[PDB]
Every structure is written in structure tokens, then in C-alpha cells.
């Protein structure tokens, strides 16, 4: 579990030269301090337990902020039920952490933090609210009103969270179609053919394996409308668990631009510094 010790070394005068190498071979010279300078025996007790993949990814990171309202459905701007597209690309921190690798395979844990506030001081009357969060896999009917039949959740998983309680939480297994999630996909979903009537038939988005990759989460307030509008927001935190990764990649160096690998704005990450300045 601990790192290897340091071996004592003495003066060297030999025909074997570990200092010289040739990076052209594509290999890293696996030297140790004892191969270039004299060293003493040191029992090593430092460990790499904090650098493991589990430890690296064992954190919950915000990925979305969903806003819903509780008001009469014909009084103001009606946005009293939302529907969020499940994706980790809405933020930058977790996306950059994940994009160190090409493929990954992990379970996931969702945690929901809900906060509410008033908007008018005329009454100040409102009772405790209950929130419904329904998962709608691709192809399932999507609600088109806050109280239509789709909310019966006959087979869709759904969470009923009462305001003021501990944050809701659930776990999801590896639900990928392939044997590992593909953070990067160098291909298309459709291929145009010479026999196609027009070019737009085979058109597709570059680096987009599928549409509706994981579905949406529908959020509403079960309570009817109080005399005053009440606004609330839902924050979603994702923690990968039991993580395996493959094929490391360089990390992102310039600001993200869209769900692809595009870059527009800055393209100048490094700062100025003299060549011979400490």
C-alpha cells in the first residue's frame, strides 16, 4: 500500500549510463534519484490512496438547476412544471473531470436539493409543498400539462419529496447500451448515400451517437395554487460510484463551447513569462 523505499547509493564510475536515453522510442526513462545522485536509505510511508479513481470521483457535483412555480395556471407566465434533459454537459467541472478518459463504466447517485421562496408580500400565506420528480425514459409519453394523465407514474420511477426534509437520494446502475460510456464519439448516426434524393436525408450531427440518450426528468409541485405565487428551484448532484476508466486523454485547455469539442472564444490559456526568469 505504501510507496517503494529509497535505496542507498554510492559513487559510480561505470560503462552503463542510465542518464542518457532516447525519447524517440516513445518511452519514459524510468529513473530514480539513486541513479543520478548519492542517496540515503529512507523507509517510505507516503501512499497514493487519495489519487485512486474512486477517491478522485468520490464527490457530488451540481449539474442542473430546475425552476418551477406554484400559481394559478392562467394568471402569470406559466412555467409551473419543468422537464430537464439528463446530461452532465450543462456544467464544466464534472465534465472536465470525466473527460480525462475516453471510456468509463460506473454506477451513479443522484441527490436533490430543493429551496423555495415567496414573490409577493400581499398575503404571505402558503402551506408546505410536495415535489414530484418523474423519470421519463426515451419513447415514453411526456407530460404536456402539470396535471395530465402522464403523472400517474404507473411504470416510470418517481420521487415524492416533501419540502423541509432531508435531500432526496437514489442510485442508478450502469444503464449504457454498450459495454462502457463513450465520452467521445468520432462518427455520425446517419451516412448519406449516392442514391439519396437529396443531401438533407442523410444529414446528422457530428459526434452525436444518439438523440434522447437518457431521457428527461419532469418536476412539478403536487400542491394546488395558493393565493400567492411561490417559486422554487431544484439542484441535482451526481456522484459516480464503482468507477472504471480507460484510455486517458489530455484535459480541456480552453473554454467549452457546446456539447462537442468546439472552441471559439479565448484559445490563449498560457500567460507571459521570460525565458530566463525564475
Amino acid at each position, epitope marked *: 500500500d505504501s510507496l517503494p523505499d529509497t535505496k542507498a547509493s554510492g559513487p559510480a564510475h561505470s560503462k552503463e549510463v542510465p542518464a542518457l536515453t532516447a525519447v524517440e522510442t516513445g518511452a519514459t526513462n524510468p529513473l530514480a534519484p539513486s541513479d543520478t545522485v548519492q542517496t540515503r536509505h529512507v523507509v517510505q510511508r507516503r501512499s497514493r490512496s487519495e489519487s485512486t479513481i474512486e477517491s478522485f470521483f468520490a464527490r457530488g457535483a451540481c449539474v442542473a438547476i*430546475i*425552476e*418551477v*412555480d406554484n400559481e394559478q*395556471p*392562467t*394568471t*402569470r*407566465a*406559466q*412555467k*409551473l*412544471f*419543468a*422537464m430537464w*434533459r439528463i446530461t452532465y454537459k450543462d456544467t464544466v467541472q464534472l465534465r472536465r473531470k470525466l473527460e480525462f478518459f475516453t471510456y468509463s463504466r460506473f454506477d451513479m447517485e443522484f441527490t436533490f436539493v430543493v429551496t423555495a421562496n415567496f414573490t409577493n408580500a400581499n398575503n404571505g400565506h402558503a402551506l408546505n409543498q410536495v415535489y414530484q420528480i418523474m423519470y421519463i425514459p426515451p419513447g415514453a409519453p*411526456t*407530460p*404536456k*400539462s*402539470w396535471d395530465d394523465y402522464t403523472w400517474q407514474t404507473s411504470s416510470n420511477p418517481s420521487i415524492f419529496y416533501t419540502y423541509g426534509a432531508a435531500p432526496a437520494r437514489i442510485s442508478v446502475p450502469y444503464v449504457g447500451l454498450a459495454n462502457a460510456y463513450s465520452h467521445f464519439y468520432d462518427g455520425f*448516426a*446517419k451516412v448519406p448515400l449516392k442514391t439519396d434524393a*437529396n443531401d*438533407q*436525408i*442523410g*444529414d*446528422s450531427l457530428y459526434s452525436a451517437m444518439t*438523440v*434522447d440518450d437518457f431521457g428527461v426528468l419532469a418536476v412539478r409541485v403536487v400542491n394546488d395554487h395558493n393565493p400567492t405565487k411561490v417559486t422554487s428551484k431544484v439542484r441535482i448532484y451526481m456522484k459516480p460510484k464503482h468507477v472504471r476508466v480507460w484510455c486517458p486523454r489530455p484535459p480541456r485547455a480552453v473554454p467549452y463551447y457546446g456539447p462537442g469539442v468546439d472552441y471559439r472564444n479565448n484559445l490563449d490559456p498560457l500567460s507571459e513569462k521570460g525565458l530566463t526568469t525564475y
Partner: antibody
């Protein structure tokens, strides 16, 4: 019946302010939003605004900031489209629209488009 | 920002069948729903299709809407064309906050 009635063709000289109205029948006018759509001769339709008396959101056209304005009147169950300074490029056919309702979403799912239209109004200068 | 391209134009004869297309160019196609509007010569626009699966009052079943998620294209199929189908057809959308109209397709029936 659930219908929107506009005024017939309207004529004004260049540089003046014009105002046209769209009146609803058979229901309360301000149940939901009112949208105004323009169609220049031989071209596709275009957006002008989507307004509602709660805040009178006069969402102008990108190239017509301020020139085009919209408002609603609860007493007469009518909405009005107003131009501040007419130009030769404002010669078009204007339609007022409205959706029966059903809109409850923060996002595209149920923030709906109109399903009933007016007969349209024409803005020209006779010649 | 984005457009709703349409096919140039179609000229047919009564009893034919056509499929008018409309290709979206931005926003997730599966999120917002495309529509269709018919404007007969010298007439106001009318609503014929929206939500991708709901049809308004007074529309004969001869007109049906359909979508292709992968290609971001919406289709309108007319089976058994009629001489009274002579009109312009526009595909309309509502992405998240505003409506964007298409370029318009002219259909001719002899």
C-alpha cells in the same frame, strides 16, 4: 364562436404612426398570450411580439427596436399593434394569433403556439 | 441563428401523394414540436398540424404529420391530392421562447 376579428386594410403615409386592433369574441380576451405575425408580399411569415397584459411584454423585432409596440385592453377584449414611424419596408399583411391555453411548462413541452388566427390586416398606400 | 429549410416546390395532379418536408437547424428537435400552416391564395393562415401528433378541428384525415428524430426533419404526407389543396404550406416551431417560421413550400395540383 372562438375567433379573432381584425380591422380591414389600413392606410397611412410614411413617417406617421399606425395602430390596428384585434378583438376576441366568445371568451375572456386575456386568458392567454397574444402574438402578432407579419407577412410581406410573397415572403414567409415573421415574428413581431408575444404580449400579455400582466407585464405588456412588447418584444420587438431585432431590426425594429421600438418602432413596433403592442398592448392589450381588458375592457374592450382587444389587443392593439402600433407603429411609431412607418417606412416603405413595413408594407405587409399582419395577423393576430392566440392559443386556447394548456400552457404550463417552463420549457417547450407546454409553452404552446397559437391555434386560432385573425383574418389579417393589410398596410399599404393606395396608388 | 437558425432556420427551417423546406423543399423548393411540388407540382402534381389530382389523386397523387406527396410528402412535404421541413428540416430544423437548431435546438433539440425532440424537445420542441414543429407545426404546419396552410395559406390558400388570398387567404389567412390556418393551423393544420402541431405537437407532431395532434390535429386541429376541420382538418380532413388526408393530412398527417410525422417526424424523423435522427435527421431533425418533419414531414407532412397528403394522400389522394385534390385540386383544392392548392396553397402555400409553412412549417412553424416554438423552440423555448419564440416562434420561427419556415421558408414556405408551393404545392401545385392540376
Amino acid at each position: 364562436e372562438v375567433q379573432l376579428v381584425q380591422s380591414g386594410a389600413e392606410v397611412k403615409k410614411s413617417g406617421e404612426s399606425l395602430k390596428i386592433s384585434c378583438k376576441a369574441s366568445g371568451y375572456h380576451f386575456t386568458s392567454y398570450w397574444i402574438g402578432w405575425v407579419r407577412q410581406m408580399p410573397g415572403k414567409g411569415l415573421e415574428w413581431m411580439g408575444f404580449i400579455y397584459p400582466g407585464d405588456s411584454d412588447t418584444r420587438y423585432g431585432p431590426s425594429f427596436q421600438g418602432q413596433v409596440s403592442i398592448s392589450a385592453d381588458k375592457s374592450s377584449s382587444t389587443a392593439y399593434l402600433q407603429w411609431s414611424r412607418l417606412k416603405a419596408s413595413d408594407t405587409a399583411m399582419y395577423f393576430c394569433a392566440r392559443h386556447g391555453g394548456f400552457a404550463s411548462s417552463l420549457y417547450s413541452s407546454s409553452f404552446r403556439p397559437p391555434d386560432y388566427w385573425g383574418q389579417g390586416t393589410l398596410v399599404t398606400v393606395s396608388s | 441563428n437558425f432556420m427551417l429549410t423546406q423543399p423548393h416546390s411540388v407540382s402534381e395532379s389530382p389523386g397523387k401523394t406527396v410528402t412535404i418536408s421541413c428540416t430544423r437547424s437548431s435546438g433539440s428537435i425532440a424537445s420542441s414540436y414543429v407545426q404546419w400552416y396552410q395559406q390558400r391564395p388570398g387567404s389567412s393562415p390556418t393551423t393544420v398540424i402541431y405537437e407532431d401528433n395532434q390535429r386541429p378541428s376541420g382538418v380532413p384525415d388526408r393530412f398527417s404529420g410525422s417526424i424523423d428524430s435522427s435527421s431533425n426533419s418533419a414531414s407532412l404526407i397528403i394522400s389522394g391530392l385534390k385540386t383544392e389543396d392548392e396553397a402555400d404550406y409553412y412549417c412553424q416551431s416554438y423552440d423555448s421562447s419564440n416562434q420561427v417560421f419556415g421558408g414556405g413550400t408551393k404545392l401545385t395540383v392540376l
